[PDB]
Design goal:
Layout lengths: L10 E4 L2 E7 L2 E8 L3 E10 L2 E5 L5 H14 L4 E6 L4 H4 L2 H6 L3 E5 H6 L10 E3 L18 E4 L11 E4 L4 E5 L21 H11 L5 E4 L8 H11 L3
Helix pairs in contact: 5-6
The protein binds the ligand NCCN[C@H]1CC[C@H](CC(=O)N[C@H]2Cc3cccc(C(=O)O)c3O[B-]2(O)O)CC1 and zinc ion (2 copies).
PDB class: antimicrobial protein
Keywords: metallo-beta-lactamase, antibiotic resistance, inhibitor, antimicrobial protein
Assembly: monomeric
Length: 234
């Protein structure tokens, strides 16, 4: 890929997607769109069900995520949560709905989805003033702990911690510590980006593996480095 990590030992190719185990019950899914840009999301095994964070870029790619789950985990997918209304995170909604999978997004992501050319999720998350999801709107999310950090990469971007692990997912908000820019800022809130990145760090203070949309997993320095680049936008 031109944007995105390269394939590495421990990675499994399945169709045109790549899967990597990060923990006993957690995998990263990676899909590509043309050069090629990689996009990452997560798959979590929770008891007798599977939870998905983010679609792939397309419906066909997202169907392949479901196929890989069937082969390698062989448990039903109970729900998916998508972290904002752009193609890399929500482009494959139709595959989930075709399969009868309950889908969740920030209410604002669902409201923006038609303007962004995305299919809205079936259910909407809302958030307290401190950024934590209102639990009534996140039914049976199990280990997925959803946090809205504030506007940054987009106004609707949300983040997800995996309870019982050292993993937190920053989506497109967080860039890795070797990044030379903040990526695609076309819909970004440059005034609040830096504070939102720091808020993500403070919401998951013990996470040591930070998973991101367009880089391999990094340490907590990714959060600080992102916030310090965002400081220069103001
Ligand atoms: C406006 C709405 C956005 C689209 C472009 C688009 O679909 N962009 C997604 C793909 C992409 C590519 C490179 C870097 C990043 C990043 O995350 O920085 C990235 O992520 B996004 O979610 O922004 C054009 C009109
Ligand atoms: Zn985006
Ligand atoms: Zn992105």
């Amino acid at each position: 890929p031109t944007i995105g990590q390269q394939m590495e030992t421990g990675d499994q190719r399945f169709g045109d997607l790549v899967f990597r185990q990060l923990a006993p019950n957690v995998w990263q899914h990676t899909s590509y769109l043309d050069g090629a840009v990689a996009s990452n999301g997560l798959i979590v095994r929770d008891g007798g069900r599977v939870l998905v964070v983010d679609t792939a870029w397309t419906d066909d790619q997202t169907a392949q995520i479901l196929n890989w789950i069937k082969q390698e985990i062989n448990l039903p997918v109970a729900l998916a949560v998508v972290t904002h209304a752009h193609q890399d995170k929500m482009g494959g909604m139709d595959a989930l709905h075709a399969a009868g999978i309950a889908t969740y997004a920030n209410a604002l992501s669902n409201q923006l989805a038609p303007q962004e050319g995305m299919v809205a999720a079936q259910h909407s998350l809302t958030f307290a003033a401190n950024g934590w999801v209102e639990p009534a709107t996140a039914p049976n999310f199990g280990p997925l702990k959803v946090f809205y950090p504030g506007p940054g990469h987009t106004s609707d971007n949300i983040t997800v911690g995996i309870d019982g692990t050292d993993i937190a997912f920053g989506g497109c908000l967080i860039k890795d510590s070797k990044a030379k820019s903040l990526g695609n800022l076309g819909d970004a809130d440059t005034e609040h980006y830096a504070a939102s990145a720091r808020a993500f760090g403070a919401a998951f203070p013990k996470a040591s593996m930070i998973v991101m949309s367009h880089s391999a997993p990094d340490s907590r320095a990714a959060i600080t480095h992102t916030a310090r680049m965002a400081d220069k936008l103001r």
